[PDB]
Design a protein around this ligand. Structure first.
Ligand SMILES: O=C(Nc1ncnc2sc3c(c12)CCCC3)c1ccccc1Br
Length: 469
């Protein structure tokens, strides 16, 4: 009869999944597949927990998740024959590399005779309609984007959650060896080293996401504490699709009327849509050269300075603590991202924003390709009509004067008083000795003179924008 596959990539959830809902209709069998292809261990652990949660939720419906390793263009032809498939569904991917992959798979599926169901559910709106309304090009200012959104039609209701009623007569063929053939692998099974690993600060999955949403909405009814990961934080769940942006939007509206909302209510989701809209028609969005919206800047090439930044060994505790929290947990505060991005690019190291993007792509759980690239251009003054220097000592000191953020992520500095915790090289030798941390030995000296470096770099950027004008 009619055998369907729903292909999970993003949208790792059973709620608000219109592609999966439409795939199930009229189908006699359904199989949900995830296909495993610069990704760090925290990202992999989050994804694997998403799949684990997906699998457990499908088992409640007497189904399972099918995890396959391979290239989709190799794998789907085999699957189409093995399972006699005539129906394939995906959530639409607006990002240019995902667009490219999906057009190839659609071609393969058509040749095989498989119909392809594509549904928008990872963004609030159809990005093509926003671009058409703005005249064929995405807006490069948030204000114009807000003007476009406010003209759009009201958001339709989120798709019905995949339940037993929705499934109807559809079923999943099961085998007793399913885990051996198609199980969700562990990190070690992928070859990752997990010896140092601690329990995840950000456990993946739709169940965690929906639990966090309820608690977030109840609570809603920077500062030193806000630097720490929040139990009600939602951005990794949005990036992976564990939490629908449309469901979040609808819950926010509901909360507002219980307590004509302004768009700033939806600012977290709208800012995400903005960068997705900017990226979708730009295949060079993640590059400087050949990118039509990116200012050409002669960035320095310095692998050693780049490695010090990436690994949190700059000798600036504020910067190093942030980069350490990012590496250990996969999330840092919005304003912390400003601090380290400025240090790497226009502020201190004059290193290309492309290098920062690569590091965040490995480490940052909530950093979608479109948002990561757009953000690094934004904060390096390379696009979005942006023309701007954070201080790598003062910024931390003002935000967490007692320095407990530093002591949490750089324990070698714990003995230092608050007076020197953000600039330990200024501490007298006796204080360094009773803290048992000599600067330049147990913790590195500052890699750059900030005042000299920032002053020169401000001049360089000013010359760039004088050349532009
Ligand atoms: O987290 C980031 N970016 C945002 N993520 C969500 N919402 C928003 S609004 C907004 C930004 C943003 C960044 C630029 C200013 C306005 C980020 C920052 C630096 C490097 C990579 C990333 Br992935």
């Amino acid at each position: 009869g009619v055998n369907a596959v729903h292909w999970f990539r993003k949208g790792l959830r059973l709620h608000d999944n219109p592609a999966l809902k439409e795939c199930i209709q009229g189908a006699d069998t359904i199989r949900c597949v995830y296909i495993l292809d610069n990704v760090g261990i925290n990202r992999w652990r989050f994804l694997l927990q998403c799949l684990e949660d997906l699998d457990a939720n499908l088992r409640k419906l007497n189904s399972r998740l099918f995890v396959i390793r391979g290239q989709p263009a190799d794998v789907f032809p085999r699957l189409f024959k093995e399972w006699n498939i005539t129906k394939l569904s995906i959530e639409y991917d607006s990002e240019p590399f995902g667009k490219e992959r999906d057009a190839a798979i659609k071609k393969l599926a058509t040749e095989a005779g498989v119909e392809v169901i594509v549904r928008i559910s990872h963004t609030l709106y159809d990005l093509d309609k926003i671009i058409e309304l703005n005249g064929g090009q995405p807006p490069l200012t948030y204000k114009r984007f807000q003007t476009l959104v406010s003209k759009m039609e009201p958001l339709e209701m989120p798709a019905d959650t995949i339940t037993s009623d929705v499934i109807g007569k559809c079923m999943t063929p099961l085998s007793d060896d399913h885990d051996e053939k198609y199980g969700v692998p562990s990190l070690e099974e992928l070859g990752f080293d997990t010896d140092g690993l601690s329990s995840a600060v950000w456990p993946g999955g739709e169940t965690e996401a929906l639990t966090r949403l309820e608690r977030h909405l109840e609570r809603k009814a920077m500062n030193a504490n806000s630097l720490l990961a929040s139990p009600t934080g939602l951005s990794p769940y949005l990036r992976f699709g564990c939490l629908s942006c449309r469901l979040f939007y609808f819950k926010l509206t509901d909360l507002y009327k219980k307590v004509s909302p302004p768009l700033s209510l939806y600012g977290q989701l709208l800012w995400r849509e903005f960068f997705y809209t900017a990226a979708t028609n730009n295949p060079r969005f993640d590059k400087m050269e050949g990118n039509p919206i990116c200012v050409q800047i002669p960035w320095d090439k310095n692998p050693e300075a780049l490695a010090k930044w990436a690994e949190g060994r700059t000798g600036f505790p504020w910067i190093d603590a942030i980069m350490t929290q990012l590496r250990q947990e996969g999330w840092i505060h919005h304003l912390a991202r400003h601090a380290v991005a400025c240090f790497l690019t226009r502020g201190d190291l004059w290193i290309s924003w492309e290098e920062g993007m690569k590091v965040f792509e490995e480490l940052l759980l909530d950093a979608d390709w479109s948002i990561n690239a757009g953000s690094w251009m934004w904060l390096s003054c390379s696009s979005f009509f942006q023309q701007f220097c954070y201080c790598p000592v003062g910024f931390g000191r003002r935000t967490d004067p007692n320095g407990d953020y530093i002591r949490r992520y750089l324990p070698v500095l714990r003995g230092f008083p608050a007076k020197y915790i953000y600039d330990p090289w200024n501490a007298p030798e006796g204080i360094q000795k009773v803290a048992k941390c000599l600067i330049g030995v147990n913790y590195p000296k500052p890699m750059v003179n900030h005042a000299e470096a920032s002053r020169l770099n401000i001049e360089r950027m000013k010359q760039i924008y004088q050349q532009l004008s």
